[PDB]
Every structure is written in structure tokens, then in C-alpha cells.
Amino acid sequence: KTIRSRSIWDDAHAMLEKAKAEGISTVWDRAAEQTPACKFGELGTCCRNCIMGPCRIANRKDGKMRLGVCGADADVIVARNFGRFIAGGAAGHSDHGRDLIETLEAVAEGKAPGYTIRDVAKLRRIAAELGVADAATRPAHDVAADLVTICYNDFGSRRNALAFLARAPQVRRDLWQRLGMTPRGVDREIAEMMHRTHMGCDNDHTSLLVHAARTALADGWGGSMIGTELSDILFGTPRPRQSTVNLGVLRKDAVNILVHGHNPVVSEMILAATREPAVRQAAQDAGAADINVAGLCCTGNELLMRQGIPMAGNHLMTELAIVTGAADAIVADYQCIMPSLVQIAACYHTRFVTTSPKGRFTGATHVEVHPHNAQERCREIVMLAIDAYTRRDPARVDIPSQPVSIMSGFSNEAILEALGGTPKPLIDAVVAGQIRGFVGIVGCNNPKIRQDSANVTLTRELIRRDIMVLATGCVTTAAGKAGLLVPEAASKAGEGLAAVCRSLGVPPVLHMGSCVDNSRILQLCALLATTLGVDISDLPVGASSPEWYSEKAAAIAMYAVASGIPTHLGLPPNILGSENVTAMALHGLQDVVGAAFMVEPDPVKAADMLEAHIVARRARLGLTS
């Protein structure tokens, strides 16, 4: 009964039973040990920013402990904690985008063996969009070098606004300018946030949250957008394609390589290495029928979008994938890689390989990958996987399920091509009421919530109401395993959405990529708002993260709100200890940026709130629901 309460999936149930019998502790077991959690940490009323503290703000009968040693009240302490929370998340996406710039610079210099510019057409378009002279005709490497220079300048301190901010409608850029939210530099907003949250600097919760919006905007319109667009340039723009999801993508007769993390610069070369004939011969000589690459988390989302590589699972499936006994190697870069995977791998034959200087795990096998040596290093990593496969215990192998078919690869380019090259067919459907609105579901998993129970229920509730769902991150696996990522899932949608979906041959849920690919949603909203001559806060759109946990999810939520997109959260951030901060997040922000946060653990109630905002925006546009 305990195992049933932790997930809605059979492959998760099977592996939780297996781990229990083998005495392997999982994320759910550790979540139980940390319950009940500290009230002050959950409320955000704890400050550790100097050693005059640590300080706790409590509501006491005797009136003590209302202020920190420095005099800060709960509003400042909660706001500064939330500001650093957002900054850590924005920094996660920022360094990711910085790595794509360096990779593209290596290709332009001819110092990346095995890497190329897969999409020169998009390279010329993005470079011309940002002001590169003669981007349409000059040599591709020269054009790439100028785009590299432009992107690096957004990681400098001399701009007035980020380069991609020009995509946002003019009314939105003027608003950001009036509010002091205009993001100037990707790294700069992160550094200034850490300065503001230092003792005795910014001590106004309104100022701190305004800069928190500015910091997250430097992510969505900077770090993440650069990461998405350069990844398509380097590795190809996604197109619609079919694949499979869940633990059944692992094969007993093959060498199973699971890529984990966020950077496609590594996993793309891992895949190229497994396709070399000499490498395949080595696997055959070892008794394997083939080498099978399968994806985890966002880098799995990336390989899914561009190569159709099947995904093994999402956040809370990562440990369970090793428990299958068929994981021969885990190739990790950085972010959201639970260090418990090292210990669980030690229980089996699995090799846990780290590849990034930023993602170091004690006890892991480190094979550091850079653009100049990726081809040889990734070949070496695959050979380690083939070797570990030879030591695999066949009696402990249990692959639980059969893979479920999914459809992926819905970039904005792919969406517009399916519409004939213009957004007019999409705008027509919204005006007609067939598609009443769009909601991006971009959440994770969280041990406090039965895995994917809220992701799937909300996705079902929204498509029932003719609201198209845009899926990224961990929701990709949830919607996939529920059979909603195929064109045949139109039968589960309402009459309006099903008709549009069947007309285009697309699912009612569109996989648009990884967590950084939420910038694709920003681009799509900006494109629609610009076309109609309105603000993004006028579009019938919404965002939802029903089962989030990370700093990156909070930064995504913040820049969606700051861009005019109403954003729902299944769980609250650590801010409830301040009524002023909570009121601003839930209500005050609506007055300034035209959107706000929503906290609601009931997915059906979450759908009512998302649909309510959509209906209100449809009315202001003069449409019927």
C-alpha cells in the first residue's frame, strides 16, 4: 500500500518492490526520514546570511524573535531567501547557455572534431535577427563567430537589454522598462541579486521581488533562450517524430546506456559513438545484440526531440532505472542528478560516469568531456558501458513494462510548418473557440506528491476543456506513459481540440522539449502577441508546475509570470511565513505585470483557475469561450 501511494505507474511499483526486497533506500524513503520538516525553513522565516545569526522569525506570545539581529523583519528575510532561490535556478540555466556558446565557438574555430553546424539555415536566421551583418551570404563559420560575440555580450555588463528581448512585444518591453525589470546581463542579474540579499543592502521586500523578476527574465529571455536556439543550430531543429517511453525502453539483449543531466553537447556525441561500426563490433563481441541508448530528464528530452531516442523516465524514475538491473552505464553532466544514483549504482554493475567539471560526484568515474576531445572521450565512455555489461548479473534483471509510443519534436519551427508557414490557422482556431487556450505544463516530480498523479490529471482536465497542453521537462514522461503524446489521444480531448488535432495530425499534448526549451513557449507567446498587436498578458495562455521541486522550476515560473503568463504551482515556495510576500506573489504582481502565481495542490481546482484566467483573457480579446 505504501508503494502504491508513491507512484501511479506499474514500472515504478515493480522497482519499488524490488528495491524494498533488496534493501535499497530510495528518494521516497529519505523523504519520509526528513518528515516532519523544519517549520522555519518551510515558511522561509530562517536567515543564515551572516554569523550575527542564524536568525529565526517566530510568532511568539511574548513578542520576542520578531526581528533578526540586524533588524530585518520576516518580509525582508523571506524575500531575500526567495531571491536567492530564483537566482540559483536562473544560474542553472545560465551556465547551460554559456556552454552552448562555447561549443558553437569551438565549431566556428574548427576546434570541435565531430561537431558541426547541423542547421545552417537557422544559424543564418538567428544571426540576422540579432544584427549580424550579411548573415544570409557570408561563410557559416564567420556568421557563427559573430553570433557567438553577440551571445557573449549578453553575458557581459554593458548592455541595456538582452538581445532576444526584442522578440517580446513593444508594450511588454515598455512595461519592463517602467518597472525596472528589463534584464541587462545574464550573469549580472544573478550577481546583483546576491549583492542585494547580503546583510544591510536591499531591505525592502518589494524591491527584492522586482529584482527577482528581473533575474528570472534574464534566464527565460537570455540563458535559456540562448541555450535552446544554439542547441538547434548545433544539433538540428526538432521535427515531429515517433519514439517510446518508460523503463521498457531498456533491452535485456543490449548494452543499455542512460544519459542523465541537461547538456546535449555530451549525449549527442555519446549517441554518435554508439553508431560507429568498430564500437558496435565490440558490443557484439561482448555478447550484446546492439548498443541501446535511452534518455533521462532534460538531456533525454533533448535526444528525444532531435534524434527520437526513447526516454526511460523522469525525475523519480532515475533511481528505479538502475534497479531494473539492466542499466550498464549512466552518463551524467549536471543539474538534477541525485547523488544517491552513485550509491545505487554501486549496488549493481552500473558505471556512473560524470563528464562535466561542474558536475562532480564523489565516487563517480570522471571522464571529462569538452568540445575539443568529445569524440575520443565519448568513445571511451561507451567502451566502459560495454565492459560493465559483461559483468551484469542476469538474475537481478527486471525490466517491468512494455514501452509506450509517443510523438515528439514540436519546436516552433515544426509547429509553424504544420500550419503552412504562418500562425494564422492557429489564430483562427483560437478565435473560433476550437482551441480555447494553451497551457504549458513544465513541472518535475516531488516526493510529497504521488508521482505524476497531478501531472496526468491536470493534463487530462485541460485537454477535456479544449485547452491545448504544451509539455516540457518531466511532464513529457507523464503525458507519454498516459498515452497522451500520440495523435490518437485526440479522442480523449474535447470536440474542438480533437478536430484541430486530427486536422493537423498532431497530439492534443505537444512535446516542446526540455526545461530550457520553455523559452520556446516564450517565443511562441511573443510571436502570437506581436502578430495580434497585444501583450502576452492578453493571450489565452497559462503555465503550470503541479509537482515542482527545484530552484530552476521557480525561476521558470517567475519569468513566466513576469512575462504576463499566469503560472500555477502545486506546492508553494518557502514564502508563507510572510503574508506581504505571499500577497505580492499571489495578487500584487497581477497589478504590475498582468500575471501572478497560483498555489493549488488539487489538479482539478488548478484547471479551474487556469481556465478562468484563459476565459477572462478571451473576453478581453472580444471572444467567446
* Partner interacting with residue 98 (select from ligand SF4, its own copies, none; CB below 5-8 Å by kind): its own copies
**What is the DSSP-derived secondary structure letter of residue 440?**
E
Interacting residues with ligand SF4 between 186 and 245 (CB under 6 A): 199
Judged by CB under 8 A, the chain residues 249 through 308 that form the site for its own copies are none
Instruction: Identify what 77 binds: ligand SF4, its own copies, none; CB under 5 to 8 Å per kind.
Output: ligand SF4
Per CB under 8 A, the segment of 63-71, 110-118, 417-425, 468-476 that binds its own copies is 63-71
Give the interface size with its own copies as a residue count (CB under 8 A): 100
Nearest to ligand SF4 of 68, 513 (CB atom): 68
The window from 91-99, 130-138, 398-406, 487-495 that contacts its own copies (CB under 8 A) reads: 91-99
In 3-state terms, what secondary structure has residue 120?
helix
Question: Within 152-181, which residues bind its own copies (CB under 8 A)?
Answer: 152-153, 155-158, 180
Q: Please, which residue, 41 or 420, has the CB nearer to ligand SF4?
A: 41
CB of 573 to its own copies, least distance (A): 7
Q: Sketch the per residue contact string, 554 through 593, with its own copies: x for CB under 8 A, - otherwise.
A: -----------------x-xx-------------------
| Pairwise CA distance, residues 284 & 159, whole Å | 55
The answer to whether the Cα torsion of 389, 391, 394, 397 is positive or negative is: negative
Quick one: which of 564, 542, 546 has its CA closest to 613?
542
Give yes or no for a contact between 540 and 438, defined as CB atoms under 8 angstroms apart.
yes
DSSP string, 163-195: GGGGGS-HHHHHHHHHHT-----HHHHHHHHHH
Applying the rule CB under 8 A, the residues between 439 and 468 that interact with its own copies are: 446-448
Residues between 1 and 60 that touch ligand SF4 (CB under 6 A): 38, 40-41, 46-50, 52-56
In what helix (H) or strand (E) does residue 354 lie, and over which residues does it extend? strand 351-354
Min CB(217)–ligand SF4 separation in Å: 25
Task: Give φ, ψ of 469 to 5 degrees.
Answer: -100, 130
Query: By CB under 8 A, is residue 42 in contact with its own copies?
Result: yes
Q: Where are the alpha helices (DSSP H) in 465-505?
A: 475-481, 495-504
β-strand partners of 544: 441, 568
Q: Which is nearer to its own copies, 72 or 414 (CB)?
A: 72
- How many CA within 13 A on the CB side of residue 91? 14
Pick between residue 360 and residue 391 the one whose CB is nearest to ligand SF4: 360
CB atoms within 10 A of CB 400: 20
In the complex with its own copies, which residue's Cβ is closer, 549 or 597? 549
Nearer to ligand SF4, 50 or 615 (CB): 50
In whole angstroms, how close is the CB of 57 to its own copies at the nearest point? 10
Among 3, 13, 20, 67, binds its own copies (CB under 8 A): 67
Q: Scanning residues 65 to 104, which ones bind ligand SF4 (CB under 6 A)?
A: 68-70, 72, 77
**Residue 261 and residue 598: Cα distance in Å, rounded?**
28
The alpha carbons of the chain give a radius of gyration, in whole angstroms, of: 24
DSSP state of 464: H
Helices 140-154, 74-108: crossing angle, 10 deg rounding = 160
Given the complex with ligand SF4, which of 44 and 248 has the nearer CB atom? 44
State the nearest-atom distance from the C-beta of 565 to its own copies, in Å. 21
- Among 529, 544, 534, 563, residue whose Cα is nearest residue 468: 544
Q: Is 420 in the site for ligand SF4 (CB under 6 A)?
A: no
Smallest separation (angstroms) from its own copies to the CB of 582: 15
Alpha carbon distance 524, 521 (integer Å): 5
State the DSSP H helix or E strand holding residue 427, giving kind and residue range, or none if neither. Answer: helix 424-432
**Interaction site with ligand SF4 (CB under 6 A):** 38, 40-41, 46-50, 52-56, 68-70, 72, 77, 199
